[PDB]
Structure 1
Amino acid sequence: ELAILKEERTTTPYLTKYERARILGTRALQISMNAPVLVDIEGETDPLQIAMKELSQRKIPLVIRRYLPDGSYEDWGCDELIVD
């Protein structure tokens, strides 16, 4: 009743720095508490490094809900958001 249609999405298609920071933090927390890792681990042990590696390959299983001022929201997958 409040979700915006995917073709009607009007927000920016790029990943903002706040969104990037929150995604990295949440993924690092999840990996730290023994969640399955979507990308192979070569020699790294730091959860934040693994989260950044997952983000670079668009392997983040998270969805951003950008809230419009009125109350409506847009759902954006981390795979479909452009990362600089």
Structure 2
Amino acid sequence: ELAILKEERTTTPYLTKYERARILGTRALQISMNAPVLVDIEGETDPLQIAMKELSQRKIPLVIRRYLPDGSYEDWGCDELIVD
């Protein structure tokens, strides 16, 4: 109802630090309770290391929903936000 389509999105396309933080945290929390990991698991076992290793090669499947001030929002995929 209040959403904005995929041509009228006008928020900045850069992954901010808070967003990065919550992505790493939540993805690590999922990797811990036995969830499918989507890279080549090798010489690191800490879940945060694995989450950052995924964020480097862009494989994280989540949706940012940025709430605009008055009540609308926008939906960005975590694999098109330009990771700095």
The answer to whether TM tops 0.5 is yes
- Deviation beyond 6 Å, 4+ runs, structure 1: none
Q: What is the aligned partner in structure 1 of residue 61 from structure 2?
A: 61
Q: State, as a whole percentage, how many aligned pairs show the same letter.
A: 100
SS of 2:7 mapped into structure 1: helix
Structure 2-normalised TM-score?
Answer: 0.97
Shift of 1:57: 1.0
Q: CA shift at 1:5, angstroms?
A: 0.7
Q: In the TM superposition, what is the alpha-carbon distance from 1:58 to its structure 2 partner? A: 1.1
Distance in 2 between residues matched to 1:23 and 1:5, nearest whole Å: 23
What is the Cα deviation at residue 43 of structure 1? 1.1
1:29 deviates by 0.2
Q: RMSD of the TM alignment (CA)?
A: 0.5
* Superposed displacement of residue 14, structure 1: 0.5
Count of paired positions: 84
Residue by residue over 1:12-60, the C-alpha shift from the partner in whole angstroms, topping out at 9 and shown as x without a partner, is 0000000000000000000000010001111110000110011111111
Map 1:1-84 to 2 at 5 A. Answer: 1-84=1-84
Shift of residue 83, structure 1, vs aligned partner: 0.6
> TM-score scaled to structure 1, two decimals?
0.97
Unaligned stretches of 5+ in structure 1?
A: none
